[PDB]
Amino acid sequence: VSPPPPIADEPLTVNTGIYLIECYSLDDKAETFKVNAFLSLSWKDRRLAFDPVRSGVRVKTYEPEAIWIPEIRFVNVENARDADVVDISVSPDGTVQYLERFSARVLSPLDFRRYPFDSQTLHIYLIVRSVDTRNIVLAVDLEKVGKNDDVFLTGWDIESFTAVVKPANFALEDRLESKLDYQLRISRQYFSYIPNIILPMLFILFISWTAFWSTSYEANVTLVVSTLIAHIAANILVETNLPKTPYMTYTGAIIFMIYLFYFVAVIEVTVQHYLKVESQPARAASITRASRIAFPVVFLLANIILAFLFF
């Protein structure tokens, strides 16, 4: 149980394939996803050549311990994959066809800049390290790359599952490593964000603007402070479903901006009361009437600017 010997001086090519059976638990905060799939492997080992006439059988079936199997690992996994060998078939020339079903929790960074209208490219990196006897290189058998039609990732649309056919061959700790990039392209189902977060957040904001049709300071204070507290609750709710990013997200920008609108509404409500107490309500009336137009107009234009900067 050592690697197959080279006929000339070539590296050993291990053909690979990943067929997705299940996709689940895309954790946005952890930037992980769980996968259940078939991993297929194929390589020539002439030491396993046989005559179907003598052995009786046209294809030989082996146990993983009985023969040499390339040590294939995943780069971006939390722990080593849970695998169960399904089959090891050896054909007369010594071509090995290896099939395993595995499950793994994959680390794959996510770009939240356009959240909740974002798309992602999840990666599964396959790797093999070369041995001293000989260099091992990975290849993609496109016939053995795919996904079950029923594969569903709750809250996401699965677009494609493809592999970058050219491996990344590089040196690591004085030995060659051959890395393959399997890419799962997904797009977020933003639907539910509209009736659950976006519209309720707009309703409470518009409710605070009713203070521009009221001269009652005590009612105005209650309108703007109460809706601000509801906005804080939405800010907290949203930030619990997201990791801390060194950049602004689209939702983060809108949520932050809405604070400025609450802050300026408090200034307006204060200025209005102050002028009324100072017996200059004609002035207060001019500021309040302007605010009725300015607040929705500046809100609309600021949102057009933000949508433009982000999309």
Report if residue 117 touches its own copies, rule: CB under 8 A.
no
- Residue 168 CB, shortest distance to Na ion, in Å, is 25
Distance CA 193, CA 251 (A): 11
Q: What is the DSSP string of the chain?
A: --PPPPSSSPPEEEEEEEEEEEEEEEETTTTEEEEEEEEEEEEE-GGG---HHHHS-SSEE--TTTS----EEESSBSS--EEEEEEEEE-TT-EEEEEEEEEEEEE-----TTTTS-EEEEEEEEEEE--SS--EEEEE-GGG-EE-TT--BTTEEEEEEEEEEEEEEEE-SSSEEEEEEEEEEEEE--TTHIIIIIHHHHHHHHHHGGGGG---HHHHHHHHHHHHHHHHHHHHHHHHTS---SS--HHHHHHHHHHHHHHHHHHHHHHHHHHHHTT-HHHHHHHHHHHHHHHHHHHHHHHHHHHHHH-
> Contact region for Na ion (CB under 5 A) — 74-82, 177-185, 216-224, 290-298?
216-224
C-beta closer to Cl ion: residue 86 or 307: 86
C-beta closer to ligand PLC: residue 62 or 310: 310
Among residues 19, 38, 50, 117, the one that binds ligand PLC under rule CB under 6 A: 117
Report if residue 69 touches Na ion, rule: CB under 5 A.
yes
- Residue 226 CB, shortest distance to its own copies, in Å, is 4
C-beta closer to Cl ion: residue 107 or 230: 107
Report if residue 247 touches ligand PLC, rule: CB under 6 A.
no
- Which one of ligand PLC, Na ion, Cl ion, none interacts with residue 311, CB within 5 to 8 A by kind? ligand PLC
- Residue 76 CB, shortest distance to ligand PLC, in Å, is 25
Among residues 38, 62, 299, 310, the one that binds its own copies under rule CB under 8 A: 38
Report if residue 262 touches its own copies, rule: CB under 8 A.
yes
C-beta closer to Na ion: residue 221 or 257: 221
Q: Which of residues 57-96 bind its own copies (CB under 8 A)?
A: 57-59, 61, 71, 73, 75-80, 82, 84, 86-87, 89
Report if residue 16 touches Cl ion, rule: CB under 5 A.
no
Whose structure tokens read 């992980």?
32
Report if residue 154 touches its own copies, rule: CB under 8 A.
yes
In the complex, the residues that contact ligand PLC under the rule CB under 6 A are 114, 117, 194, 198, 202, 254, 303, 307, 311
In the complex, the residues that contact Na ion under the rule CB under 5 A are 69, 222
